Amino acid sequence: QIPNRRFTLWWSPTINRANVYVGFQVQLDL
Amino acid sequence: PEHVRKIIRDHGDMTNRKFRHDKRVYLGALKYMPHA
């Protein structure tokens, strides 16, 4: 899970946007 | 005759006009809807 965590965090603006996932408004915390 | 115009007039009253003990049968008998 450790190399999977570094790869998912590196492409965080590419893998988490409005075009890549359409219907979503989830906020994490404050 | 014009009897159906009076019965459907009492729709959402506060248990005093066709709503005391008939609201359970009103949503259950209407579950045969698409045949109508």
Binding site: - | R24, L27, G28, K31, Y32, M33, P34, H35
Partner: protein, 133 residues
């Protein structure tokens, strides 16, 4: 108008079964191991019926353990049988072992015929089909 009148003509028998249970819950309130268990329970049913010579200190799980050690000895293709036993008890044990060998060989050839492409999905059946062959 003709197509959508037939749409409700097909949904009127449907929706009484679709939304029939939905209006009812508001007032009513809502593998191969089975063949191994059925062969094991029928073996105990046959051993308790096919001549136990009455109530004369009859068999137990050790007789089923004798059938278990006979299948494990045949599984490695070893010539080790189960010697030192009565002849009808050994014949009843060898009959269920020859029938279980027919089930396991047919289950091996069925998975191998679907091993080329078959289903394009195999989680633990790939290790079992390679071990059986």
């Amino acid at each position: 108008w003709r197509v959508w009148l037939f749409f409700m003509r097909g949904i009127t028998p449907l929706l009484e079964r679709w939304l029939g249970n939905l209006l009812a819950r508001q007032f009513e309130g809502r593998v191969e191991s089975h063949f191994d268990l059925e062969l094991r329970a029928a073996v105990m049913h046959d051993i308790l019926d096919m001549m136990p010579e009455g109530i004369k200190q009859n068999k137990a799980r050790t007789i089923l353990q004798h059938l278990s050690e006979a299948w494990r000895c045949w599984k490695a293709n070893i010539p080790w049988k189960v010697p030192g036993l009565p002849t009808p008890i050994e014949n009843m044990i060898l009959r269920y072992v020859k029938a279980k060998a027919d089930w396991w060989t047919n289950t091996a050839h069925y998975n191998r015929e679907r091993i080329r492409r078959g289903a394009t999905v195999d989680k633990t059946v790939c290790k079992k089909n390679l071990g059986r062959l």
